[PDB]
Every structure is written in structure tokens, then in C-alpha cells.
């Protein structure tokens, strides 16, 4: 029993993306060749996670369910739940309390795109840590926007601040977290912040003080993207297009990852790629086996 | 009589774009900072057309209606009608027969993106043509994919073929057409081709055989874009992003066009810019007035 | 142009019914007062379908042709084609590609018996849906045997599995399907399943993901029969006998349905019932007019 | 001499069963778990008869041959001969004259189903009778339909009439008869009746007038079934289904009878049970040995 359950928090309205998000849900927007939701979903599968709860707005939840179903086609077990109002990342564990039960869990933001040659290994370690938590961070130019993590002369994380007026560093904690079961009771005791939200940073600070928090780095060989603005969104799509078209590889293709993790076998892949063989998406899969 | 009516055919399922078009209508996909449907709408607007019929599938028509409404916000009159199945472009005149009536009509595909400094002047002539039809052709590398038009030494159109295995030229007829009322009766008497579709090319050939076909060239300063594949889709988005960011202008922005053409006043622009004031899209509108 | 064409897949060997099927084709076995084939045939006529292709084994195909002919006696247009080997339900659209052409179609299993006071209405809706598909489902005690459809807390179908080891529900998709023209291209891209067959469920899952699939229920007032075993077969016959003998009505009598749907007139019915007036079969018809 | 020869008359067209008998021979229709022909075959088998002639129409004879073959699989010797037209039951002796030769013969209708615990003992006496004939009578409600036999106070048969408008009793003579060699010459000298048929009743009356007619009662524990109509057909099937399912026994199963009577051994039973091992029919055979 380890981090066998995951949650994808895909709520919000994406107002900064208007008018593109007036007709399409942000997490359904394409990132080159696939819907945005495929990326965070692929991140959890890479960690060996099959039981995944997707939390979204009452309007967008059914659209994700139509696209993905129960995930059985990829050897997954997808569930869904609505978030009435975006009260904060931490509320994910409140809404997913029954789903999580007594197991470990992982949380990823539905609009964060992760990629890196060593990503699988990086998360393998996070999954094998049954007590405590693991967060990920990387350098940015606008730390005041995200949760910040400060290290010491050695290289240990000693502080965390949610959007500090004067950041202690430029290392922001990304939207990917791995917790043990104690995270549920933590979120239930949290109180609203200055902005009236249950902060994920308040939970991570506790694991830190207990000395049970790992802070893995997503630097040097990792992709650092943002889907928040029209400009950042297209940059993200260009990144994916560039690596897929120039290096001949697929990034966050759930059918491929499901095969690699042995969620589905070769026969199943061919069955899935059959109907999709009209474009290179299905052809790549047919070549894979 | 000036052409004051237009039809935007935004149906289909865009299989070549799977899986992005699985839970999202192709014509709703973003093209950098706005949904695809905005582009062809703008084209008709630049032609002075304000009475527009939008045809889509029974599943997608309601989504466009939810996005564009009646178009009154832009001083437009938008109507909707469903196309049961993709039986051909020409079927838009049979579906929109009641819409058209006795007036001339324009047809533009919902996934075609037109941009050019002289685009308005180019269509101004087509809109003012008394009797006959006007199409546009431009050079491409894969003519076999589109409707092909061949010219004679004099420079007159003498041959029209749909996806010829042996193209008699490299000039493709794009998805923008201006017809007089006689098109309706033409479409009604059309018989499906091998693929069982009411071919627009058959219509154009009829106008040509009658010697009433005008073919305006859309070369030089005109954008030649395609939204058929993931690769060409991102190229289109990059085109728009590049022009807007480096030349400080908006391509096919309904609010700006409606203003520049006086369809709406300055007070209204501010109202529309409000919900979009979080990004450069809305701010551009505020700065405009 | 709607679902005007139908296919009856009546192949197989019915080995589980041996030795009864050693001398008689399964679809010719009597279900009380009429041959089994009359039921699925009557289901398509009730949907207003007149152009019907019957697919069967090279041995049994000519026997159906002898019994039914070209169906002109009932205002139908029956065609026949042989299926060399039972490669799967989906192969029906491959074998019937020329027959289907560019029209919509419906597929029914030759050994499924449907009945219900509201059946006509239920299918009327399915026939009027030109884009997408409609499948039917009902509760069972052995879901692992059929295609399973899972719904959500609301009441929408969100998943489909062909004989799941651990069914998500007890709602099996019966042998009755209505598709648009896109079903042909779908079946041609399908790949064999674990059992080496082209699954109808693989096609239905695609319509589901596209949000173009309707899942009508054949519950409460509908008959739920099975012709697979000696025990189920006689139960099915007893059901028909019971309703016909105790409620004085005919179930799936093609001459009656042909009259009700106006395929044939009163004079034609009398002409047909004349020679059959030796038993109550022809007498009922003579009384009907 | 014991009667070691039998004739099964399985011709006709069964018009009363239309339309089930249109493309299917009446004697091939299933009676729950086996074709009708199996029942009368079993009756002769229980009487020790192994040399059997099966007479049917020119169109159906080949279908029975395809089903039963030569009967060697059951240690039987089966032969086939066609009956051009339905000129009467007595014509079976004229057609089978060469088959019969100088031996006694038994005649059973192909659509008559006999079952009774004491049935074997009942026929054992008839088979061992030296000279004369033996018929069977039982009570019915519509004697006018069958051959009627009246008894005197002493209990002796004194009157035989075919379908009497005014039956002198309610005892019908069933379709099972045991005759000595003199029947052949009797049949040959028979003159057709009003309906132009060689009446079996005329034959039986001849044996009666000579004082050589034995009439065994087939009442009490004997099944009285009729396959003439859809209603009585399903009642027969229900009878068999009920006895087999509730009393765990098979009615008229050739494989079991051939075994119980040692016509075939246990090794052979297994061979025959193989192709039937998918249902309770074959499994019953395997469990038997
Ligand atoms: O209750 C909520 C809150 C957020 N979201 C969505 O989750 C994503 C989060 O983006 P955002 O609101 O801008 O993140 P912040 O809340 O500002 O900050 C959190 O997410 C950052 C990563 O973007 C971390 O660096 C911070 O430490 C963490 O506290 C978006 O798509 C939101 O719409 C929900 O669905 N429900
Ligand atoms: O009945 C129909 C047919 C098409 N479309 C839509 O129209 C666009 C056209 O795409 P597609 O059907 O694949 O193009 P073709 O029909 O193969 O070709 C037509 O469009 C080309 C430009 O793209 C022209 O060059 C050709 O001459 C013209 O016949 C798409 O967004 C379709 O979904 C509909 O909505 N309904
Ligand atoms: O290539 C084929 C396959 C089947 N059949 C016949 O069609 C009927 C289908 O019965 P069966 O083989 O047992 O159905 P399955 O293939 O096990 O499953 C299909 O039929 C079920 C209804 O019985 C559905 O619930 C499932 O979703 C669907 O995939 C039978 O009379 C078959 O002989 C053919 O004629 N040709
Ligand atoms: O030339 C003939 C006559 C009959 N049959 C078959 O024999 C069975 C008898 O049916 P049917 O002809 O309708 O019965 P009847 O000839 O009217 O009556 C006969 O069979 C009855 C039992 O069913 C007896 O009671 C009567 O005395 C006897 O005359 C059927 O399966 C017939 O197809 C033949 O194959 N060939």
C-alpha cells in the first residue's frame, strides 16, 4: 500500500484566457495534439497511479467524463466529483475524503504540464515514500506568484511561503504533490487564508516542520510551462510540437504510458489505435507495438 | 444589390484532429487568443455582412449559440440551423433556403482563416457584383486535396475539378464564396458525387460554364493557412500570435471590427472589454476607444 | 434521408442448441407460431425500415431467401449476402458496405426477440437521430456475458465494456443498433479483440467519447428474452404464446406490421392472409382489416 | 417371430403450422431439446426395433438423411425412401414392401410423441405377437379428428371409423401400429376413400373383422400429446421440458436408449456426447456413463 490514488484538480473558470475559455473548458483546450487534461493524467499514470479522482466544476465535470469515461480503456479507474466553488487546492482532500479512504494520495493541478526524461524516476521515489510528503520545485522569474521554497547553504528546504511580498528565493513549488494518509486530517483542520482559501502550503509547511517533507527539483532537464495566458499557452503547445515533431516522440500520450506501465497489453493498444489510425496519433501507437 | 447575407458552415467532426476534437468542436478550438469560429465571422463582417446563418451539427450548434448568442452585442443578426449529416457544402443553400430568400448569399467555411491588408477591398467587389458568383484561388503544394481551378493563357478560368488525382494546376479554390440568388436552385438540383456529397465545385463549375464565374486571386499579402492537422493548426495559431504580438494589431476580433465599421459605438466596446480586461485581448479594446 | 436501411446478422452455428440446430437453422427455429427471423425483421419494419440486408452462412442464406424472398409481398426490399466466417458483429458493416452506401443504417441480431408496448416509439426516436448512434440496454443477472454500459449518479452513460471480469453495472447493451453513415469508416479501421473479433462495443465507445451516443432503456415494460439455450428458447416461446393466447394479440407478425406502417394496403393483406387462413394466423389478419 | 422392422412416416407439409413449416419440415421442428423425429425413432428403439425405414417427401427425405445418416452411430440400420404424394398412411407398406419382405412390421407417425413408464412393456407384447395386429387407443375430447374405436360391454373392439361426424366413443387410435406380414397385401388391395387416401383405419378394420385385432390401452401414466397446432405443439414441448427438468431424465434420447439397450457401448457414448457437451443434453450423456 503506497501512493496508489491520485486526484486531478481541474476547476476554475480560466477568465484570463477569455474569450477562448468561453466555449471550451480550459482543461480541454488542445496542447498541440491532445487535450490539456491528458498531461496531468499522464503524470499520475507514470507514477503507477490507476485510481484517480477528477474534481471539476458542475459544468465541466460531465465533459471530462464524456472524453475519458471510467478510464477502463487505459487500465485506469476514473471517478468524478464536483467542486461547487474553488475554495482552494487543499479542499481537494476534503471533497475526495471518501475516495482517498485510508490510502496514500497524490494531487496534480489539471492545468500543469510536466515533462522530463527523468520524470518517471523522479516520481518513482515520491511514490515509494509512504510516510511524509514530496513536493517539486523549480526556478522562475515571478516567484511572488507561486508557493516559494527556501533552501539553506547546504541544500535543504527550510521554509515555504504562499506568494511572498519579498520572496526568499526563486524556487516555486509546482502543482504536483504526494502525501500519506495523514493529509486528510490536516486539510480538515485548515483555516482560510488572507484570500479566503485552504492553502496547500499550510499543509506542506507542517510536513516540513515534522521533517517529513521531501523537495525534489524539476530543473535542468525538465519542462517549465504555464497555461495561464494566451502567450504562455501557445508557448506550451510549441514546446510539445517541437519535441514531438523534431525528436519523433510523444509526450503524455495516455495509451503509450498505459502500455509502458503494463496497464494494458499489446493487443489492447492495437485495438485502441485502430480507430485513431487516421492521423499520426494512432499510427505512432501501431508502430509502438 | 449588395450581398448582406452570409452562411458559415461549421459542422463536421474533424477526425484528423483526434483526440482534440473528441469532446470539442473543431470550430471552437482556439487559434491563439480566440475561438476558430471568430475568424470566418470576421471575414463576413469585413464584407459588410451582418445577417448571418451558422450551420453546425445537432450536437454542436447549441454550443455556438451559447458563445455567440444572437450577435446583437456586435450589431449582428445571428441565426442557427442544424445540418443532420455532412452531405456536402452545397447543402448549406438547401438548409439556408428560407434564410437566403431572394437575396444574394455568401458562404464561408468555419475552419478557414482569411487575413490580408487588402482583404476588405478584395471582398468589396465580390459583394457588389450584380449577377453571378465570385471565388478565390491561391497557390498550394497539394492541390489534389482541394478544389482545383485551371486558367488559360488569357488568364480565364476554364476548368474546375474536386481533388484531382492529376491536378491541371496548383491553384486551389479556398473556402470563401459569393453567390447570387440562383445558387439556391442550383444546389437543390445537384446530385451527389461518388462520395455522396453535394459538391460546391459542381456549383462553381455551373457558374463557370454559364460564363458568370469571377475568380479573384488571393495571393501576395494574404495568409494561406490550414486547420486540417495538428501541425497545420499550430502553424495557423503561430501566424496569428506572431502578427498580433509583433505588429500590435488584432486579427479577426469581432468587437474591434464592429467598432471600426460602426456596427457598435464606443460605449458598447467598453462594456464588452470588461470581462476581457484581464488580458491583452480586452485591454486592447479599451485602449482602442 | 435517415435510418432507412437495416441489416440482420443471422450467422453462427448455434452449437449450444444441438441437436436441434443440426437439422434446422437457429433463425428458422419456431418461437411459438412463427420463425425466429420474423422477430428481428419485424423490429426493423417497426422502425420504418424497408431496405434490409440479411447476412448469414453460405448454408443458411438460401433457406432465408426461400422463406422470405425479396420481401416485396410485405412492401420490403430484402437482399442477401454470405458471411464466410463469424468475425464479429462489426464485420456486418464491412460486408454490407456497398448495400449501405452513404445512408444511415441499423443493425439487429437475427436471434434477438424484442417486444414492448412502447417499442415503436422508442425506435421512432432512434430513427430520427441522423447524427450519432442509439443503443439499447436493460438489466440482467449475467452482465459479464454481454456488452455492459455504466451510468453516473445522474443517469448518463459514461462507459462501455465487452464482457467485463467485474461489471461496473448490470445493464447490458442488447443486439439492436442505429448508426449514421460514419459507422462504415469506423468498422473498416477496427482491429481484432482479445478473442479475434471486430467488436461492436469498440464502435459504440467512439460515439460515446464523441458525445454522439444515445442509450435508450428497454426495461420496465419490455420483454427480455434469450434464444441461446433449450431452456431460454422455450421460455421465449412461452412468453410469446402467453401474450398472444391470453391477451389476444400478435407479436412481430410481419404482415400486420407491414399494414400498420402502410407498406401494404388492406387489399394486399387479404390477398396474403387468404392462403394462410387455415389456422388463426391468417384469420387474425382477415379480422385486422 | 419378433418384430424387428419399423417404418416412420415423416412426410406431409404441416399446413396447420404455417408459417413455421414453410421452410422447415414439421418432423424436424424442435420439441424442447431435440427434433421431433427423435421421438418416434425412440419408440421403435424401445421396442427393440433397429432396422427402420423413414419415409418422407422428396424435398425433405434428404434433410433427415443429413441428420440421422445410416443410424450406425446408435447401432441402428436406417434406410430412406420417398413418398411422391400424401396418398395415405397405408401407402407406407406399398412403398416399404421391399423393405418389409416376409417379416412383420411396425408403423409409427413421425409427429406422434409417446412417453410412459410402462411404454416398453406395453410394446414388448405387441412385438412378440405371432400373428395379427396391435393398435393403441386412448381417451380424447375431439374423437371426430382421429380414427375412432368403439368397445362392447365385454371390452372388445367392435367398430372402427375414420373421423366420424358422430363418434360412437371417445377412444382414438393413436399413430402407433404393429402388424404381421399380411398387412402388405392388405394395403396393396386398398381402394382410396372419399378423400382419395389409403386409410390405415380400413386396414385396422380388416384385422378386426378377421378377429385378429388387439387393442392395447395407452391411458394412465402415458403422455397424450399432439403436434397439430402451434398451441398443442408448445404444450408438447412444455411436457418434455417439464419432465426432463424436474425429474432429471431424458425423454426419447437415442444415445441413452441405444446405451441402456446395449446397442452401443460406453466408449461410443462419450464420442457422441462430445459435440453436445456444451449443454445439458450432452453433459447428461457423459454423466450417464
Ligand atoms: O479550489 C480551487 C483552486 C484552484 N483550482 C484550479 O487549480 C489551478 C491552480 O491555479 P492557481 O489558482 O492560479 O494557483 P494558486 O492558487 O495561485 O496557487 C497554488 O498553485 C501554484 C501552482 O500554480 C503553487 O505554486 C502554489 O504554491 C499553490 O498554493 C487552476 O487551473 C485553478 O482553476 C481549482 O480547481 N480549485
Ligand atoms: O456537409 C458538410 C461538409 C462539410 N462541412 C464542413 O466544412 C469544412 C470543409 O471540410 P471538408 O469536408 O473535409 O472539405 P471538402 O469537402 O473535402 O472540400 C471542400 O472545401 C475545400 C476547402 O477546404 C475546397 O477546396 C473544396 O473545393 C470543397 O469541395 C469542415 O469544417 C467540415 O466539417 C460541413 O459542416 N458539412
Ligand atoms: O460475426 C458474427 C458474430 C456473431 N453472429 C451471430 O450474432 C448473434 C450474436 O450472439 P453472440 O456471439 O453470443 O454475441 P457476442 O458476440 O458474445 O456479443 C455481442 O452481442 C451481445 C448481445 O447478445 C451484446 O451485448 C454485446 O455487446 C455484443 O458485442 C448470434 O446468433 C451469432 O451467431 C454472426 O452471425 N456473425
Ligand atoms: O400419405 C401420407 C399421409 C400422411 N402422412 C403423415 O402422417 C402424419 C399424419 O397426419 P394426417 O394426415 O393429417 O392424419 P390423418 O391422415 O387425417 O389420420 C391418420 O392419423 C391419425 C393420428 O394422428 C389417426 O387417428 C387416424 O386414424 C389416421 O387415419 C403427418 O405428419 C403426415 O404428414 C404422410 O407422410 N403421408
Coordinates of N, CA and C in Angstrom, one line a residue, chain C residues 138-208:
Chain C
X138 N -30.7 -3.1 -20.9 CA -31.6 -3.5 -19.9 C -30.9 -4.3 -18.8
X139 N -31.5 -4.4 -17.7 CA -30.9 -5.2 -16.5 C -30.9 -6.7 -16.8
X140 N -29.9 -7.3 -16.3 CA -29.7 -8.8 -16.4 C -29.0 -9.3 -15.1
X141 N -28.8 -10.6 -15.0 CA -28.2 -11.3 -13.9 C -26.8 -11.8 -14.3
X142 N -26.5 -11.8 -15.6 CA -25.2 -12.2 -16.1 C -24.6 -11.2 -17.0
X143 N -24.4 -10.0 -16.5 CA -23.8 -8.9 -17.3 C -22.5 -9.3 -18.0
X144 N -21.7 -10.1 -17.3 CA -20.4 -10.5 -17.8 C -20.5 -11.1 -19.2
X145 N -21.7 -11.5 -19.6 CA -21.9 -12.1 -20.9 C -22.0 -11.2 -22.1
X146 N -22.6 -10.0 -21.8 CA -22.9 -9.0 -22.8 C -22.1 -7.8 -22.7
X147 N -22.3 -6.8 -23.6 CA -21.6 -5.5 -23.5 C -22.2 -4.8 -22.4
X148 N -21.5 -4.2 -21.5 CA -22.0 -3.5 -20.4 C -21.9 -2.0 -20.5
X149 N -22.9 -1.3 -20.0 CA -23.0 0.1 -20.0 C -23.1 0.7 -18.6
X150 N -22.2 1.5 -18.2 CA -22.2 2.1 -16.9 C -22.8 3.6 -17.0
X151 N -23.6 3.9 -16.0 CA -24.2 5.2 -15.9 C -23.6 5.9 -14.7
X152 N -23.9 7.2 -14.6 CA -23.4 8.0 -13.4 C -24.6 8.3 -12.5
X153 N -24.3 9.0 -11.4 CA -25.3 9.3 -10.4 C -26.5 10.0 -11.0
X154 N -26.3 10.8 -12.1 CA -27.4 11.4 -12.8 C -28.2 10.4 -13.6
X155 N -27.7 9.9 -14.6 CA -28.4 8.9 -15.5 C -27.8 8.9 -16.9
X156 N -26.6 9.3 -17.1 CA -26.0 9.3 -18.4 C -25.0 8.2 -18.5
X157 N -24.9 7.6 -19.7 CA -24.0 6.5 -20.0 C -22.6 7.1 -20.1
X158 N -21.6 6.6 -19.3 CA -20.3 7.1 -19.3 C -19.2 6.0 -19.6
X159 N -19.6 4.8 -19.7 CA -18.6 3.7 -20.0 C -19.3 2.5 -20.7
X160 N -18.4 1.7 -21.4 CA -18.9 0.5 -22.1 C -17.8 -0.5 -22.1
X161 N -18.1 -1.7 -21.7 CA -17.1 -2.8 -21.7 C -17.7 -4.1 -22.2
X162 N -16.9 -4.7 -23.1 CA -17.3 -6.0 -23.7 C -17.0 -7.2 -22.7
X163 N -18.0 -7.7 -22.0 CA -17.9 -8.8 -21.1 C -16.8 -8.5 -20.1
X164 N -17.0 -7.6 -19.1 CA -16.0 -7.2 -18.1 C -15.9 -8.3 -17.0
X165 N -14.7 -8.5 -16.6 CA -14.5 -9.5 -15.5 C -15.3 -9.1 -14.3
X166 N -15.3 -7.8 -14.0 CA -16.0 -7.3 -12.9 C -16.9 -6.1 -13.3
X167 N -18.1 -6.4 -13.9 CA -19.0 -5.4 -14.4 C -19.2 -4.2 -13.5
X168 N -19.3 -3.0 -14.2 CA -19.5 -1.8 -13.4 C -21.0 -1.6 -13.1
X169 N -21.8 -2.4 -13.9 CA -23.3 -2.3 -13.7 C -23.9 -3.6 -14.2
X170 N -25.2 -3.7 -14.2 CA -25.9 -4.9 -14.7 C -26.7 -4.5 -15.9
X171 N -26.4 -3.4 -16.6 CA -27.1 -3.0 -17.8 C -26.3 -3.5 -19.0
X172 N -26.8 -4.5 -19.7 CA -26.2 -5.0 -20.9 C -26.8 -4.3 -22.2
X173 N -25.9 -4.1 -23.2 CA -26.4 -3.4 -24.4 C -26.9 -4.6 -25.3
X174 N -28.2 -4.5 -25.7 CA -28.8 -5.6 -26.5 C -28.4 -5.6 -27.9
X175 N -28.9 -6.5 -28.7 CA -28.5 -6.6 -30.1 C -29.3 -5.8 -31.1
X176 N -29.4 -4.5 -30.8 CA -30.1 -3.6 -31.7 C -29.4 -2.2 -31.7
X177 N -28.9 -1.8 -32.9 CA -28.1 -0.6 -33.0 C -28.5 0.3 -34.2
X178 N -28.5 1.6 -34.0 CA -28.8 2.5 -35.1 C -27.6 3.5 -35.2
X179 N -27.1 3.6 -36.5 CA -26.0 4.4 -36.8 C -26.1 5.4 -37.9
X180 N -25.2 6.3 -38.0 CA -25.3 7.3 -39.1 C -24.3 6.7 -40.1
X181 N -24.0 7.4 -41.2 CA -23.1 6.8 -42.2 C -21.7 6.6 -41.7
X182 N -21.2 7.4 -40.7 CA -19.8 7.3 -40.3 C -19.5 5.9 -39.7
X183 N -20.5 5.1 -39.5 CA -20.2 3.8 -38.9 C -19.4 2.8 -39.8
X184 N -19.5 3.1 -41.1 CA -18.8 2.2 -42.1 C -17.3 2.4 -42.0
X185 N -16.8 3.7 -42.0 CA -15.4 4.0 -41.9 C -14.9 3.6 -40.6
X186 N -15.7 3.6 -39.6 CA -15.3 3.1 -38.2 C -14.9 1.7 -38.2
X187 N -15.8 0.8 -38.8 CA -15.7 -0.6 -38.8 C -14.5 -1.0 -39.6
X188 N -14.1 -0.2 -40.6 CA -13.0 -0.5 -41.5 C -11.7 -0.3 -40.8
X189 N -11.7 0.5 -39.8 CA -10.5 0.8 -39.0 C -10.3 0.0 -37.8
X190 N -11.3 -0.8 -37.4 CA -11.3 -1.6 -36.2 C -10.3 -2.7 -36.3
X191 N -9.7 -3.1 -35.1 CA -8.8 -4.2 -35.1 C -9.3 -5.3 -34.2
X192 N -9.0 -6.5 -34.5 CA -9.5 -7.7 -33.7 C -9.3 -7.6 -32.2
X193 N -10.2 -8.1 -31.4 CA -10.1 -8.0 -30.0 C -9.3 -9.2 -29.4
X194 N -9.3 -9.4 -28.1 CA -8.7 -10.5 -27.5 C -9.2 -11.8 -28.1
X195 N -10.4 -11.9 -28.4 CA -11.0 -13.1 -29.0 C -10.9 -13.1 -30.5
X196 N -10.2 -12.2 -31.1 CA -10.1 -12.1 -32.5 C -11.3 -11.7 -33.3
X197 N -12.1 -10.8 -32.8 CA -13.3 -10.3 -33.5 C -13.4 -8.8 -33.5
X198 N -14.1 -8.3 -34.5 CA -14.3 -6.8 -34.6 C -15.5 -6.6 -33.7
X199 N -15.3 -5.9 -32.6 CA -16.3 -5.6 -31.6 C -17.2 -4.4 -31.9
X200 N -18.5 -4.6 -31.6 CA -19.5 -3.5 -31.9 C -19.3 -2.5 -30.8
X201 N -18.8 -3.0 -29.6 CA -18.6 -2.1 -28.5 C -17.4 -1.1 -28.8
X202 N -16.5 -1.5 -29.6 CA -15.4 -0.6 -29.9 C -15.9 0.6 -30.7
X203 N -17.0 0.3 -31.5 CA -17.6 1.4 -32.3 C -18.4 2.3 -31.4
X204 N -19.3 1.6 -30.6 CA -20.1 2.4 -29.7 C -19.3 3.3 -28.7
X205 N -18.2 2.8 -28.3 CA -17.3 3.6 -27.3 C -16.9 4.9 -28.0
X206 N -16.7 4.9 -29.3 CA -16.3 6.0 -30.0 C -17.4 7.1 -30.1
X207 N -18.6 6.6 -30.4 CA -19.7 7.5 -30.4 C -19.9 8.1 -29.0
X208 N -19.6 7.3 -28.0 CA -19.8 7.8 -26.6 C -18.8 8.9 -26.3

